[PDB]
Amino acid sequence: GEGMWVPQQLPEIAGPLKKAGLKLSPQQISDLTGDPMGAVVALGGCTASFVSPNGLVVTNHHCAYGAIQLNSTAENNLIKNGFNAPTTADEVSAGPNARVFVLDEITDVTKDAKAAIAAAGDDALARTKALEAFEKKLIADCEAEAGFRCRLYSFSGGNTYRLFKNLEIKDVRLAYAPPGSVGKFGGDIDNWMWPRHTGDFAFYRAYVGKDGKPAAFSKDNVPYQPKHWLKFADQPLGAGDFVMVAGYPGSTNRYALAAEFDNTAQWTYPTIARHYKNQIAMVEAAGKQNADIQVKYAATMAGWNNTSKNYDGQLEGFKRIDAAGQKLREEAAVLGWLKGQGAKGQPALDAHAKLLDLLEQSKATRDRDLTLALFNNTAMLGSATQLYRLSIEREKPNAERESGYQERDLPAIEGGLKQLERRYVAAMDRQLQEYWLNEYIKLPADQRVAAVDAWLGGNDAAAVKRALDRLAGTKLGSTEERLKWFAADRKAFEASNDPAIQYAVAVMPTLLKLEQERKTRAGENLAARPVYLQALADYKKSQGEFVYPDANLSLRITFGNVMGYAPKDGMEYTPFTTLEGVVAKETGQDPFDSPKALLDAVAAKRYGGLEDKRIGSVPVNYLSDLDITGGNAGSPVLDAHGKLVGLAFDGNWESVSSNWVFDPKMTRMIAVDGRYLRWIMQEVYPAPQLLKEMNVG
Amino acid sequence: GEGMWVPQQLPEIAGPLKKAGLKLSPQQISDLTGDPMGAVVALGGCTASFVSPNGLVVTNHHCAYGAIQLNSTAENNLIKNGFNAPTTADEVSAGPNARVFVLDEITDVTKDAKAAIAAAGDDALARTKALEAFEKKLIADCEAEAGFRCRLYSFSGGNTYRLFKNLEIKDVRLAYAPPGSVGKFGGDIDNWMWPRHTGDFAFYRAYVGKDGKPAAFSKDNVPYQPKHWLKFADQPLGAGDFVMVAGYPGSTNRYALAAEFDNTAQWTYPTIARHYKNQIAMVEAAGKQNADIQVKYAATMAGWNNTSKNYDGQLEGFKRIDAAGQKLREEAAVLGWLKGQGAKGQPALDAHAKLLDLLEQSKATRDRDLTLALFNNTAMLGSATQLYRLSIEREKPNAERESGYQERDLPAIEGGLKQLERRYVAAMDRQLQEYWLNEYIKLPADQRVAAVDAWLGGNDAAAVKRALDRLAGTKLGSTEERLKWFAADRKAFEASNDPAIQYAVAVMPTLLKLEQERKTRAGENLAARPVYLQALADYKKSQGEFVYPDANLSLRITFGNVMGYAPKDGMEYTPFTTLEGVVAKETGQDPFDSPKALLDAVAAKRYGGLEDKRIGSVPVNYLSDLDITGGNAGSPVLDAHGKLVGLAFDGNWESVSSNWVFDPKMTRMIAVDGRYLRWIMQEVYPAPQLLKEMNVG
Ligand SMILES: [Zn+2]
Ligand SMILES: [Zn+2]
Ligand SMILES: [Zn+2]
Ligand SMILES: [Zn+2]
Ligand SMILES: [Zn+2]
Ligand SMILES: [Zn+2]
């Protein structure tokens, strides 16, 4: 059911947990470094979990796909064939940027955070600056012990702050991946869809140095020995059974004001989807003649195509359930209730009014803010603005520098400059500059920027065509040139007659103002947001409900049951798929082309001891009413006793609105059953050593 | 489950009945004139049932559609608006050809039948003639009492013969029909499909004369008073509940030899579907310019389009389940078993061999037999051959005349001659003569008919074009001319220089030979068929199974349970549809255009006391594993206590092979729930008087 619950509040929702089917105490699962939550690790963008005392880590195949790809060549194509390391020495590096973060300590720092906010008071902008400041110092201090990465997270509008210190494992090796036609069966056709038949799993192993401290890749490293790890279920999972997921959902906005929501649904999402569709059109079209354009923009267009399709999906989902109506009605009920109280209710009504003010402020300049951001996200101008900005930031003490522009950020920046080249064609990027300058000249005139008009030398298509011509003389199309500028101080920027650099110098005063306008609204949100949210929580209590905080990249538990859904009268989606269903989709050309050993095993009914009696086959994937979102890929699904019964890997189409709502009747997670993991590793692409290692061989 | 059981064998299948859920004794439902089977009536082509002591009869809306249409004008359009008779005087005639047949007496005449076959022995053709003879006399005698129609039916290859004497009610009036957008919701789009949301019901009332004997329509008639009638369930029907249907399925061929089946599936069905598709192509094409062609051929093309689509459906269903394989395997097992016996098994092996002989005989001339039949089914030549044939038959005593060509048949013949005109255009029919003559010249030469080649004056396209030209001089395109010939004796036929008539005179000796070849194979089938079938029954017993006879237009009981099916992994069709599902399909243009009072009632949740708690709405249609086929439309669905819970009206797509197999996992009947009948009659198109009459008002 609905909710991304923090571990610390589990004892408080004991009754609902118990009622859903949980058999462990809330106390035991409320311990983030205990059994089993201390087994759950973050990979940065994906969830994963320890599954052996010798550092074996399980996650999705699409989470590991970069690692797998990195180790693949046409000659030895792991993507297609799968990968299996018979001994730990056979295991291959996932790359320098691969991580496993294991929780080591949590601290509640709410009082210190709130003081640094308070003690620098009344002034919104300075409130935002004092919180930044507090944060940068806390992390610096916490990260003084080498081998740790620390993060500070704010809950429910900054009602609570917690510091997480994580062991940062930096040598991650690939141990196993099924063939791609298992790990990605159905491809893009079956994405977001049920029925699903995708074996979306893979295994890493975590390594440390002989001294037990994190270390970069080295053949002197040895497997990390986790304190906790998960074990495979010994009871079969069936329809109605309790399940729970632990993972790191990135963000939700479940408590947004009705007007905030209307703004996104009526302006933000349609606007961004239109832009993205337009840029896609132009890449494909340019792309059919070049061929260099269509290879270098390929990932770019895929990213825009996802978001475009995602937003369009959400917008349809909103209509389906009248999202904006329900939000309006609930909100009226909360305001009604607050008026209900006396003087007591006034603070929350104020906070609400203020939030509505802040919303109008940001709406006044929304076309401009968006257009400018995306224009500055084109290759030569992004490059120019980022580097000039770095040059300004470099002149303050590292501690006073803007996050993203610090010592620690420098390798990431330098890397993007190089990476840039793989996705940049001058002819293409000029069409994209054109596109965005034309969006800028079409803005409502009250959101023009005098600075930008000044640099353009006007505000119509003729000024734009001139500026494009002027800009084609930049040298920043060259990686050398960009690293040159990477090194340059700001007087060099302000003396440059390179037209990309002159743009950056001309717009930066404006970019900085807008930044400080954002931080000012944030400083205000800091005061009003927790107060409004506290009142939502109070009103929920009065209806006997519990509340959970919006997701914020911290570990959460969602719980519920295995169950299907019915999108139409006379029909139901059943909670499980089976082996025979994989085979019935076989074409086999991509993406419905299973390995021959799979086709044969299912044809022989070689179920390998894993058959579930209730469905009469080995289950493949399943549906349940858990509440997950981006960041939960790879998350372990556990049963009523804390044992591993699957991995989260996708949602059904009706999950696409997870940022905004949860629909008890239709929102479902799609998991791959742990029995399918085992079956694949027994009968199709065998990993006897790993099964032996996990006590199921 | 599988089986169309005759009432007399129900006590013998007591255990399976009891186990499925039946709560009445087998004894009670085995009585064809008792409670409730004596309520079930035949309409000629459709099933129906008495539902009141005052003669009210319920059936499907598509069964009553002719009656409804007959009473409709553009001004007063019952098809669209529905019809409701507030008093019995408001009830309107269903037409002179409408019937309700009520069972009055059954007799087992097996011994007399078998004697007349035996006593005229050894000779196959004469066996066929003696059975014809026996039959014509039995019926004549039985029908001596005015007001009765009698029928003789042969069971399991003529192992048993029963005589049914039925009261023939001839004044049938329409009492109620819902609007067409209920009675035919979904139209042709939802035909053969689930999910289904069609209120396919209508009500007649049966009338007799003031003396209680059948009579043709007259305002002096009064309602017939049936001895038994059905009552509406007082328990809600749910998933898994026992259901049974009683009705008059026309024909099945469940025990066909594997080779008989291969012949149909590999030759008959594909051949006929091809022909029908070709003739359709030519009607549409000619039809777009005429407009008179496309109106007069409209029903013709619909008939060909059904059969074509039906056959294509069956052929796909056969592949889906490997029908030909299963038949082969079962058959091998039966032959195996028979060899298993000693001398005892030899008669059945002989019978089988003989059946296989008879099959080869008919296969030797199958292209010819088919081509000639369909050529003689064109308007001018059918007309010519039927009338010449009548002229020959007229010269023997009525008793010795061929069935179809007797005194009793004469009005039917005269009517077709007139009706002909509504579906005949000379230009069109000439293209159809052309089509068929070209099929004839393309035959394998070993199936040519010297007679036909003789009349053509050759056997190629030039002879065909000449014959078409010759034939366009017929006068039989005129209804007058045809009635003229209706009256004519055979010397007049044999002296005619009308080219249609000259064809008839030239081919008749051949048509008569082929007829006698058919009756000869039949006479043989009479001896070998029951013996093979008896051995199938014996082999079934040895596996502990019961056997049912192929359908033959007599009353049968099928039983089973309410249940869905799952055509694909991860998905199921649920056994019920609901009101909200009707509304969710609303477009409303035809055929998804429900009455506004339906849309409003569902929107208000005016469930009228009929809501089933398990589904949370009023059920609309449901699925079950009963075994029905053509003739079962309108059949009452009864529950475990013999109460009315619905009417059969269609099958799911996987039912399309009902003539040949039954698939326990996929074959389903679609019924309209009796609660939906009541709901429509309470909330949408009200019939309070009828609900009061049936004790649910
Ligand atoms: Zn237990
Ligand atoms: Zn442990
Ligand atoms: Zn099994
Ligand atoms: Zn009872
Ligand atoms: Zn009765
Ligand atoms: Zn209700």
- Cα–Cα distance list, B473 to A281, B455, B502 (Å): 67, 15, 12
One-letter amino acid of A685: Y
Gaps after which residues in chain A, C–N over 2.5 Å? none
- Closest Cα partner for A72 from A43, A95, A99, A88? A95
Contact A577 B568 (CB under 8 A): no
Q: Terminal CA-to-CA distance of chain B, rounded, Å?
A: 35
Q: Phi/psi of residue A690, each to 5°?
A: -75, -40
Alpha carbon distance A115, A455 (integer Å): 44
Contact A197 B580 (CB under 8 A): no
Nearest to B195 among A197, A568, A580 (CB): A568
Alpha carbon distance A49, A58 (integer Å): 6
Compute the radius of gyration of chain A from its Cα atoms: 26
Instruction: Tell me the structure's resolution in angstroms, rounded to a single decimal.
Output: 2.1
Q: Taking the alpha carbons of A8, A9, A15, A20 in that order, is the dihedral positive or negative?
A: negative
Alpha carbon distance A268, B412 (integer Å): 73
- Find where tokens 């179920």 sit: A607
B interface test, pick of A190, A568, A569 with most B CB neighbours within 10 Å: A569
**Which residues of chain B lie closer than 8 angstroms to A190, CB-CB?**
none
Alpha helices in B202-267 (DSSP H): 258-263
Contact call for residues A498 and A451 (beta carbons, < 8 A) = no
Per-residue DSSP letter, A237: P
SS3 A101: strand
A351: tokens are 């906070």
Alpha carbon distance A369, A271 (integer Å): 12
The neighbour count for residue B48, using CB atoms within 10 Å, is 30
- Cα–Cα distance list, A635 to A55, A176, A671, A672, A694 (Å): 17, 17, 9, 11, 18
Ligand nearest to the CA of A608: 3
Cβ neighbourhood burial of A517 (10 Å; 0-12, 13-18, 19+): middle
Reported as half-sphere exposure (CB side, CA atoms, 13 A), residue B64 has a value of: 36
Alpha helices in B288-376 (DSSP H): 292-296, 298-321, 323-340, 346-364, 366-375
A197 CA distance to ligand 3 middle (Å): 20
Closest Cα in chain A to B565 = A571
- Cα–Cα distance list, B69 to A219, B77, B447 (Å): 88, 8, 45
The neighbour count for residue B424, using CB atoms within 10 Å, is 19
DSSP notation for B492-546? HHHT---HHHHHHHHHHHHHHHHHHHHHHHHHHHHHHHHHHHHHHHHHHHHTT--
Contact B573 A568 (CB under 8 A): no
Alpha carbon distance B336, B356 (integer Å): 17
Alpha carbon distance A537, A255 (integer Å): 10
SS3 B310: helix
Alpha carbon distance B553, B80 (integer Å): 32
A125: tokens are 């902008």
A14: tokens are 């004991």
Contact B571 A568 (CB under 8 A): no
**Which residues of chain A lie closer than 8 angstroms to B195, CB-CB?**
568-571
Alpha carbon distance A56, B501 (integer Å): 92
B612 CA distance to ligand 6 middle (Å): 8
- Find where tokens 């690790």 sit: A41
Closest Cα in chain A to B579 = A569
B613 CA distance to ligand 6 middle (Å): 6
Ligand nearest to the CA of B53: 5
Q: Degrees (nearest 5) of the Cα angle A399, A404, A406?
A: 35
Contact call for residues A238 and A543 (beta carbons, < 8 A) = no
One-letter amino acid of B614: R
Nearest to A195 among B568, B581, B584 (CB): B568
Alpha carbon distance B67, B50 (integer Å): 18
The 3-state secondary structure of B544-599 reads CCCCCCCCCCCCEEEEEEECCECCCCCEEECCEEEHHHHHHCCCCCCCCCCCHHHH
B234 CA distance to ligand 4 middle (Å): 11
Contact call for residues B201 and B57 (beta carbons, < 8 A) = no
- Find where tokens 């579907």 sit: B273
Alpha carbon distance A164, A494 (integer Å): 41
- Sequence-distant (6+) residues with CB within 8 A of B682 are B608, B610, B691
- Cα–Cα distance list, B635 to A164, A391, B45, B246, B558 (Å): 71, 87, 11, 6, 11
Alpha carbon distance A437, A90 (integer Å): 53
Closest Cα in chain B to A565 = B571
Q: Phi/psi of residue A559, each to 5°?
A: -135, 160
- Find where tokens 């399991």 sit: B156
Determine the angle formed by the axes of helices B379-393 and B499-542, rounding to 10 degrees.
80
- Closest Cα partner for A2 from A628, A662, A669? A662
- Closest Cα partner for A380 from A337, A338, A424? A424
Contact call for residues B643 and B231 (beta carbons, < 8 A) = yes
Contact A573 B578 (CB under 8 A): no
H/E element holding B108? strand B100-108
Technique used by the depositors? X-ray
Contact call for residues A183 and A650 (beta carbons, < 8 A) = no
Cβ neighbourhood burial of A8 (10 Å; 0-12, 13-18, 19+): middle
Alpha carbon distance A186, A593 (integer Å): 9
Alpha carbon distance B11, B25 (integer Å): 8
Strand partners of residue A102: A167
Nearest to A569 among B566, B572, B580 (CB): B580
A354: tokens are 């203020």
SS3 B643: coil
Alpha carbon distance B202, B131 (integer Å): 39
**Residues of B contacting chain A (CB within 8 angstroms):** 194-197, 566, 568-574, 576-578, 580-581, 584
Alpha carbon distance B475, B496 (integer Å): 11
Reported as half-sphere exposure (CB side, CA atoms, 13 A), residue B334 has a value of: 24
Q: Taking the alpha carbons of A631, A632, A634, A636 in that order, is the dihedral positive or negative?
A: positive
Per-residue DSSP letter, A131: H
Q: Taking the alpha carbons of B398, B402, B404, B405 in that order, is the dihedral positive or negative?
A: negative
B554 CA distance to ligand 5 middle (Å): 21
Contact call for residues B437 and B467 (beta carbons, < 8 A) = yes
- Closest Cα partner for A92 from A205, A211, A226, A220? A205
- Closest Cα partner for B621 from B233, B240, B200, B203? B200
- Counts for chain B of helices (H) and strands (E), in that order: 26, 19
Chains A & B: contacts with CB separation below 8 Å = 52
Contact call for residues B40 and B15 (beta carbons, < 8 A) = no
Q: Taking the alpha carbons of B299, B304, B308, B310 in that order, is the dihedral positive or negative?
A: positive
Closest Cα in chain B to A568 = B581
Alpha carbon distance B680, A567 (integer Å): 25
Alpha carbon distance B620, A516 (integer Å): 62
Contact call for residues B499 and B455 (beta carbons, < 8 A) = no
B36 preceded by cis ω (within 30°)? yes
Contact B573 A569 (CB under 8 A): no
Alpha carbon distance B394, B489 (integer Å): 8
- The alpha carbon torsion through B518, B522, B524, B527 (nearest 10 deg) reads 180
Closest Cα in chain B to A571 = B573
A331 CA distance to ligand 6 middle (Å): 28
Q: Degrees (nearest 5) of the Cα angle B480, B483, B487?
A: 140
The neighbourhood of ligand 5, an ion, using CB within 5 A, equals: B 35, 228
One-letter amino acid of A427: A
H/E element holding A451? helix A450-456
Closest Cα in chain A to B616 = A569
**Which residues of chain A lie closer than 8 angstroms to B568, CB-CB?**
195, 581, 584
Contact call for residues A461 and A438 (beta carbons, < 8 A) = yes
SS3 A162: strand
Reported as half-sphere exposure (CB side, CA atoms, 13 A), residue A381 has a value of: 26
**Which residues of chain B lie closer than 8 angstroms to A580, CB-CB?**
569
Alpha carbon distance B240, B575 (integer Å): 9
Cβ neighbourhood burial of B44 (10 Å; 0-12, 13-18, 19+): middle
Contact A574 B580 (CB under 8 A): no
DSSP notation for B21-82? T--S-HHHHT-TTSTTGGGEEE-SSSEEEE-STT-EEEE-HHHHHHHHHHT--SSS-HHHH-
Contact call for residues B631 and B550 (beta carbons, < 8 A) = no
Alpha carbon distance B441, B475 (integer Å): 26
Ligand nearest to the CA of B609: 6
